[PDB]
Design an enzyme around this catalytic site. Structure first.
Site, PDB file in Angstrom:
ATOM      1  N   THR A   1     -59.686 -17.526   0.461  1.00 22.53           N
ATOM      2  CA  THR A   1     -58.251 -17.365   0.274  1.00 22.53           C
ATOM      3  C   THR A   1     -57.362 -18.025   1.330  1.00 22.53           C
ATOM      4  O   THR A   1     -57.852 -18.635   2.282  1.00 22.53           O
ATOM      5  CB  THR A   1     -57.920 -15.856   0.175  1.00 22.53           C
TER       6      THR A   1
ATOM      7  N   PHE B   1     -52.648 -20.268  -2.531  1.00 21.95           N
ATOM      8  CA  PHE B   1     -51.412 -19.477  -2.612  1.00 21.95           C
ATOM      9  C   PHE B   1     -50.169 -20.244  -3.040  1.00 21.95           C
ATOM     10  O   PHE B   1     -49.393 -20.697  -2.190  1.00 21.95           O
ATOM     11  CB  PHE B   1     -51.128 -18.816  -1.262  1.00 21.95           C
TER      12      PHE B   1
ATOM     13  N   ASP C   1     -53.806  -8.735  -9.627  1.00 18.27           N
ATOM     14  CA  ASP C   1     -53.698  -8.709  -8.173  1.00 18.27           C
ATOM     15  C   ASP C   1     -53.045  -7.405  -7.718  1.00 18.27           C
ATOM     16  O   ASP C   1     -51.830  -7.341  -7.525  1.00 18.27           O
ATOM     17  CB  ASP C   1     -52.879  -9.910  -7.691  1.00 18.27           C
TER      18      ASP C   1
ATOM     19  N   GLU D   1     -61.470  -7.955   0.910  1.00 17.00           N
ATOM     20  CA  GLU D   1     -61.269  -8.801   2.073  1.00 17.00           C
ATOM     21  C   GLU D   1     -61.782  -8.309   3.417  1.00 17.00           C
ATOM     22  O   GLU D   1     -61.610  -7.145   3.771  1.00 17.00           O
ATOM     23  CB  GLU D   1     -59.780  -9.120   2.185  1.00 17.00           C
TER      24      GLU D   1
ATOM     25  N   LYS E   1     -63.808 -11.667   0.285  1.00 15.09           N
ATOM     26  CA  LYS E   1     -62.647 -12.506   0.530  1.00 15.09           C
ATOM     27  C   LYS E   1     -62.457 -12.808   2.021  1.00 15.09           C
ATOM     28  O   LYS E   1     -62.369 -11.887   2.836  1.00 15.09           O
ATOM     29  CB  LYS E   1     -61.427 -11.788  -0.057  1.00 15.09           C
TER      30      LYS E   1
END
EC number: 2.2.1.2
Lengths: 316, 316
Positions: free
Chosen positions: A155, A177, A16, A95, A131
């Site tokens: 996400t 998350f 990440d 994203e 994303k």
């Protein structure tokens, strides 16, 4: 052996970060980025070439400053994705503008635009994950995109309602998350310390994993946003886990094999009827944590986006 | 004279309670109720007749226990409304099941059902306000109901986005919750004490009032849910204010005339284009307070509803 090597037996490791230095060090299968990580990566000295390159390309595409900032910002995100794909065999997650989180049409358009930029660079769809935030609108956008050959990473997933709707829409992957769920409980509950097995984020992902395998859903479950290696170890067995470089380093410097924690050994069960928007809204909003965190996560990513456009603007 | 008498010169006084004793004492123009107040009122000894009456009526309408609990619960709310209308010249606000807050169709159906019960008792629509939560779905429900001659009270209003959407839908009245806005800031901000003029709830209602009068919207603005008489006095001039009996008592026992605070003396301005769902969602969710409080208010009212059905159930 070390923890990292041991984890790879049960779980696919994903990095990440937008920093290629980490790719070389940990050799992850995939890599995930976000507005915040793109912004930070823009500070990396060796990434200056990517920025100028994006700006130059933008100015060659149009003479309108408004459109140039957008093209420049999108091209930068793609340029960083391109450098990463040279070092990883898997996929890169890029994203979409978070300001479009509650707009299905605009989200679909933006996703196709990003895909267009990757394709123009010679990259096929199988190497990319678009994303988007897991709002009802983002889920509806992803359902459509998947049918058109565009795989998505849903996400900012917090509630079970979101997890269920995502599986029912057939999205390629979800990113719950873990760490932010822990943050909420630490700040809104009496208990400020949790054992790995009782970490709310860990419990949440474990339940989602069970529900998914139990019903034969193919959506990949990838836990993200961790606060400590304890959460990671407690989720060993999860399809994939995207981990920040700092935690990746801790795992690699730790000795001792670990045991698989997440598994489903039963038979597949029948799927229920699809959840409707009304039911989705009722159930999601029944979760105080999810209500707060989903909206907050979107607000923050939107701000990171604006800051990035600012930086790009002063270069045009 | 006393504060209460003085306030009546600028603002229409409404009593926020299901207890008829307050109606006789303060002679309000209208009265507002809610699931919570209906529940408490059910404890009032003299209201036993209303409960038995509702249960008896329900059993005479159908032989299905499931449907009897619903008919009994709705009939009780209406019976209490009927007692109140005998003591007030204005309207009574009766709230629809909060569990339907995110379902437009179900909300419209429930509203018509409640209207049906009032009509069967001989009460016309002009004496009633159907109260619904100000979610996008509730606003869409109210827009439709208003066209069919059913006036609505859009409650649990927290964000400016909600206020704007309500005005654009042409609803009869809105109920912004002043006190709960203060609660959020006290619990999530450093500052725990506010001067009346700086009270976040007061500032919020003042801005909504200005926006409404500035654009010639006819929607009635009625502040609700107060924490102290300071908030009330600072909103003198608001179209209406629904106040709990305890605060009504404080105002009546206070001496000294007050001055009008809310006024719009300019000319009407042109209205902008209508806000879309996507824009509504983006703007509402930009407000951390509104995000939390709207969802929370709905959760609590739903629980009060369930408790009331419980009580009624043990009587069938």
């Amino acid at each position: 052996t070390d923890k990292l090597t041991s984890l790879r037996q049960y779980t696919t490791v994903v990095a990440d970060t937008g920093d290629i230095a980490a790719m070389k060090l940990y050799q992850p299968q995939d890599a995930t980025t976000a507005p915040s990580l793109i912004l930070n990566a823009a500070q990396i000295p060796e990434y200056r070439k990517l920025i100028d390159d994006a700006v130059a390309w933008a100015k060659q595409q149009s003479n309108d400053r408004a459109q140039q900032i957008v093209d420049a910002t999108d091209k930068l995100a793609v340029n960083i994705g391109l450098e990463i794909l040279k070092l990883v065999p898997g996929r890169i997650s890029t994203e979409v503008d978070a300001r479009l989180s509650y707009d299905t049409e605009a989200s679909i358009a933006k996703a196709k635009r990003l895909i267009k930029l990757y394709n123009d660079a010679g990259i096929s769809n199988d190497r990319i994950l678009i994303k988007l935030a897991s709002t009802w609108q983002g889920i509806r956008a992803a359902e459509q995109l998947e049918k058109e050959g565009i795989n998505c990473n849903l996400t900012l997933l917090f509630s079970f309602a979101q997890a269920r709707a995502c599986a029912e829409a057939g999205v390629f992957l979800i990113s719950p998350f873990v760490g932010r769920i822990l943050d909420w409980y630490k700040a809104n509950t009496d208990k400020k310390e949790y054992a790995p097995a009782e970490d709310p984020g860990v419990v949440s992902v474990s339940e989602i994993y069970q529900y998914y395998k139990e019903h034969g859903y193919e959506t990949v479950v990838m836990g993200a946003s961790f606060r400590n290696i304890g959460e990671i170890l407690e989720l060993a067995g999860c399809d994939r886990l995207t981990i920040a470089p700092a935690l990746l380093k801790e795992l690699a410097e730790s000795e001792g094999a670990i045991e698989r924690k997440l598994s489903y050994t039963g038979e597949v069960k029948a799927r229920p009827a699809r959840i409707t928007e009304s039911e989705f809204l009722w159930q999601h909003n029944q979760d105080p944590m999810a209500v707060d965190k989903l909206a907050e996560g979107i607000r923050k990513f939107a701000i990171d986006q604006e800051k990035l456009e600012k930086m790009i603007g002063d270069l045009l």
